[PDB]
Design a protein around this ligand. Structure first.
Ligand SMILES: [K+]
Ligand SMILES: [Mg+2]
Ligand SMILES: [Mg+2]
Ligand SMILES: [Mg+2]
Ligand SMILES: [Mg+2]
Ligand SMILES: [Mg+2]
Ligand SMILES: [Mg+2]
Ligand SMILES: [Mg+2]
Ligand SMILES: [Mg+2]
Lengths: 98, 150, 100, 75, 94, 153, 49, 177
RNA sequence: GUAAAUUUAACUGUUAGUCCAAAGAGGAACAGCUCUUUGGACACUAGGAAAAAACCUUGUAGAGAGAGUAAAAAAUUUAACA
């Protein structure tokens, strides 16, 4: 699991649906998707950054070529932060046990 | 040249050295000649050096076969499946010992050009740069020359 | 009220020195995009008798007009969309090395 | 000028060389004074002794320090 | 339309060359270095009379080493073992 | 007030050193408390090894261009660390961080040699042509872990 | 390393940019000052012996 | 950033549309700003073979300003190939004939002299006036600051600024002026 | 201050020369001209003066995805008058 991502190993369908259920277990309001960044909307190579906001507080943000794809990516980023599988998380401790 | 030869990125076998180090050398097959003049150094290596070398490398199986041959050779086989055959023709005992020790220290990957003298599966910790990394946001996300509530 | 750089686009940079002065400590927490600086996503996009069938509107175009369409679509020149001979196709490495 | 540079042991550029401040040595320096940088040697702690021969360093200021600990000063 | 007759940097008619701002600074920088060299050559530690003979002993001994090395040239020794070890090329296992 | 009456750049007033010294202590203590409570994830470091500065993190690989006189599998500590950083804080040396502050350890996993390198010389119309092939020894190091201790005072 | 830090550690690079900007401003104050003030906090040099 | 591999690469190498206002601005300073963005030289991830260029939109190219007498001195010359087809026109004549030619030629000369330059020009959009197509407007991202500060005319100064500047001399009371 | 020098033994090749700086001669105080002298460079490396044998910087050889430097960018805009 050195370079592998969480969802590259755990394949899921509709991450947004799973994200909503996780927040309900944590008594957190439903996230709201908004466009934080946008570039080349009318062109063939767009860029969108969709941010998920709970109680008007940013929890995750994700890029994508379309709003639907970027929103799905943001849900994956939110799940990674909630589950602790961030890219910059603490590396596995392979040292000898004390 | 680099264009006329293959290339690869720096890597290891099964992330060797991360949890534990496993010697990638797996097998050494020597072919020495009893009477061959070019195998004089090979015979010297077998008499006094291969026995001590086997003690220091319990994980490497060494096969010494004494058969008539004009060019003695040593075949090194690694865990990843790579097979490397090296000639010890008219080599002294010291040169053979250096060559054998060189084979033990190698990972078995192809000895070709390596594009980068470093490898990392997590090159970024704070987040890879994108064009909006250092761009401030505007109120209501209005684009330049955009009118709100027309 | 002095700040070496604005703290409104990337992170809040705070510079400090230890007591001995041998170490520079930088505290740069990330900045979150405010809710007020975001646009809502564009969620919104007859008694017909016959079932609505999918209609193929992709009409074939000649080599000339197609490349003009491709060049304008991606803002490139026409030269990229012309083919190349077998000599260059066979030289391409179909299994290039991959890093991470 | 090429020969005098060899006599003074200045074959390699940017390599400091120590010479005595005597008229005969200065006579050679005057010939190639346009090819060299001349600085006086400073001894803040005096000449190196047998005990600290191996702990000497020539700083960019022309000072030869007899102690070189590679540590920051505590002051 | 503007061409230099013959070669550019040689001849009666040459392409003009002009001194840039950094070209002057580089020359002045080297002039300052040589000016300081003039100062440090103005204060000899000893006079010529005092200097005389103060290193004659070392210079003579240095040349005697050169003479000794020059006159020490001779063919190297030859050993029986070196000649006999050539028989090992036909050494074989029993 | 004219166009050249004042310099184009705006005036800059540096903070009071007496007040800023207190501010620096607060920042150092804040970052030091993060290390005590372990409020950091993956750490990246810039180490000076074999005349070159390598930006490394845990589980990385570096290809040194010379033999290190070390058996394969031996673990060594890189004592020259110019920078250690996290997701929120970064420590800078002047020019090197203290040994007690940061500890970087690496493992020797491969001792090999480079691919053959062609060294060719050629001068036209002079019958000048020589060829040499060189294989430089190499050592592969795997960065195992990067550890920081609360030594910021 | 700075090129790598610019691409993969933008937050660290901004701190380096801010540090250079702060040191640059301290140099300007020193030039304008007559020398009757202490050195800048980031302008101090660690001496080695 | 904990992004997936495909979106992470897409975000880094995305194209950004920049808007530059050329009113009362020298074309060369506009060209220098545009040239950097077109080549991708403003990105830390820049490389010649990475094709990291961006789109530059310049408006009010008809209202550019030339320092000195460059309107009457600067000459744009080209040859049609046929004998006697050497045409030389001043900057003033070229500007009136084509309002976007002066800025276009300045940007074209600053780009690298290779086969990527013509592609980079396809990302450059020039408009003589404030009119910009709706599609071009909808994809704009950031407006670059004007390289030159436009000086204010005498009548643009407020009374407070006029009162602030002191009178320097006392004219004679009997002078006709 | 330096490490070369002479002698003895055995030979080959070079003996059709270019520019620059300097003192001169011939020509016309012409030549990328011709002839001597002092020195440099070229006929060997690399950087620079745009391209560049002769100007400038720099030489002793390998590997590096380190670093400090050397030479190194052209300046200038003018006619009133008792
Ligand atoms: K000429
Ligand atoms: Mg010519
Ligand atoms: Mg074209
Ligand atoms: Mg002869
Ligand atoms: Mg001649
Ligand atoms: Mg000569
Ligand atoms: Mg010849
Ligand atoms: Mg050249
Ligand atoms: Mg050298």
């Amino acid at each position: 699991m050195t370079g592998k991502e969480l969802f590259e190993m755990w394949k899921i369908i509709n991450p947004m649906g799973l994200l909503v259920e996780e927040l309900k277990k944590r008594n957190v309001s439903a996230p709201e998707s908004r466009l934080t960044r946008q570039s080349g909307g009318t062109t063939a190579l767009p860029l969108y950054f969709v941010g998920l906001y709970c109680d008007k507080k940013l929890i995750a943000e994700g890029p994508g070529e379309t709003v639907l794809v970027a929103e799905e990516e943001a849900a994956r980023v939110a799940l990674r932060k909630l589950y602790g599988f961030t890219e910059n998380r603490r590396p596995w401790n392979y040292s000898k046990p004390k | 040249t680099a264009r006329g030869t293959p290339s690869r990125f720096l890597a290891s076998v099964l992330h060797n050295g991360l949890g534990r180090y496993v010697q990638q050398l797996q097998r050494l097959s020597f072919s020495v000649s009893r009477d061959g003049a070019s195998s004089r150094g090979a015979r010297e290596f077998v008499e006094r050096e291969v026995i001590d070398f086997a003690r220091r490398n319990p994980g490497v199986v060494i096969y010494v076969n004494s058969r008539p041959c004009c060019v003695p050779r040593v075949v090194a086989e690694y865990l990843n499946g790579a097979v490397r055959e090296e000639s010890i023709h008219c080599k002294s005992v010291e040169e053979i010992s250096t060559l054998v020790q060189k084979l033990a220290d190698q990972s078995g990957l192809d000895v070709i050009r390596i594009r980068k003298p470093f490898h990392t599966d997590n090159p970024s910790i704070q987040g890879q740069w994108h064009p909006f990394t250092n761009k401030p946001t505007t109120f209501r996300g209005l684009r330049p020359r955009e009118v709100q509530d027309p | 009220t002095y700040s070496p750089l604005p703290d409104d686009y990337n992170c809040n940079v705070e510079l400090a020195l230890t007591s001995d002065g041998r170490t520079i400590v930088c505290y740069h927490p990330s900045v979150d995009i405010p809710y007020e600086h975001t646009k809502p996503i564009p969620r919104p996009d007859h008694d017909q008798v016959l079932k609505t069938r999918l209609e193929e509107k992709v009409e074939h175009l000649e080599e000339g007009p197609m490349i003009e369409q491709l060049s304008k679509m991606f803002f490139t020149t026409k030269h990229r969309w012309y083919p190349h001979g077998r000599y260059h196709r066979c030289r391409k490495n179909l299994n290039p090395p991959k890093d991470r | 000028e090429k020969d005098i540079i060899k006599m003074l042991g200045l074959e390699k550029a940017h390599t400091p060389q120590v010479h005595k401040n005597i008229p005969s040595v200065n006579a050679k320096l005057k010939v190639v004074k346009h090819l060299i940088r001349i600085k006086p040697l400073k001894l803040p702690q005096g000449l190196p002794a047998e005990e600290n021969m191996s702990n000497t360093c020539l700083k960019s200021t022309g000072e030869l320090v007899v102690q070189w600990h590679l540590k920051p000063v505590e002051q | 339309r503007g061409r230099i007759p013959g070669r550019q940097w040689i001849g009666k008619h040459r392409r003009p060359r002009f001194v840039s701002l950094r070209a002057k600074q580089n020359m002045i920088r080297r002039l300052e270095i040589e000016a300081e060299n003039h100062y440090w050559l103005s204060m000899p530690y000893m006079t010529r009379e005092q200097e005389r003979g103060h290193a004659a002993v070392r210079r003579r001994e240095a040349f005697e080493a050169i003479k000794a090395a020059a006159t020490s040239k001779f063919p190297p020794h030859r050993f029986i073992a070196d000649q006999l070890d050539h028989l090992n090329v036909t050494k074989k296992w029993s | 007030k004219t166009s050249l009456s004042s310099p184009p750049w705006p005036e800059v007033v540096l903070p009071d050193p007496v007040e800023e010294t207190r501010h620096h202590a607060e920042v150092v203590k804040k970052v030091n408390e993060m290390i005590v409570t372990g409020q950091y994830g993956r750490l990246f470091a810039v180490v000076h090894f074999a005349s070159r500065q390598w930006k490394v993190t845990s589980e990385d690989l570096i290809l040194i261009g010379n033999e290190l006189d070390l058996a394969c599998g031996e673990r060594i500590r890189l004592e020259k660390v110019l920078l250690v950083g996290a997701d929120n804080f970064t420590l800078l040396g002047k020019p090197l961080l203290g040994k007690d502050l940061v500890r970087v350890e690496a493992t020797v996993i491969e001792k090999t040699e480079s691919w053959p390198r062609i060294i060719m010389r050629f001068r036209k119309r002079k019958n000048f042509k020589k060829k040499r092939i060189v294989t430089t020894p190499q050592t592969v190091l795997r960065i195992n872990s990067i550890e920081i201790a609360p030594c910021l005072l | 390393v700075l090129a790598d830090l610019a691409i993969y550690e933008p937050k660290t690079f901004k701190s380096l940019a801010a540090l250079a900007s702060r040191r640059r401003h301290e140099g300007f104050a020193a030039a304008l000052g007559d020398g009757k003030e202490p050195e800048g906090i980031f302008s101090r040099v660690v001496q080695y012996h | 950033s904990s992004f997936s591999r495909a979106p992470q690469q897409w975000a880094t190498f995305a194209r950004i549309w920049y808007l530059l206002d050329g009113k009362m601005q020298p074309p060369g300073k506009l060209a220098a700003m545009a040239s950097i963005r077109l080549q991708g030289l403003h990105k830390p991830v820049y490389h010649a073979l990475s094709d990291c260029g961006d789109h530059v939109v310049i408006m009010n190219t008809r209202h550019i300003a030339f320092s000195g007498n460059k309107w009457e001195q600067k000459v744009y010359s080209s040859h049609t190939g046929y004998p006697g087809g050497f045409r030389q026109v001043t900057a003033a004549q070229l500007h009136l004939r084509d309002p976007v030619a002066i800025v276009k030629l300045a940007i074209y000369g600053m780009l690298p002299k290779n086969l990527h330059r013509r592609t980079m020009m396809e990302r450059l959009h020039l408009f003589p006036d404030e009119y910009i197509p709706e599609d071009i407007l909808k994809n704009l991202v950031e407006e670059l600051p004007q390289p030159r500060k436009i000086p204010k005319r005498l009548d643009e100064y407020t009374q407070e600024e006029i009162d602030a500047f002191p009178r320097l001399w006392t004219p004679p009371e009997d002078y006709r002026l």
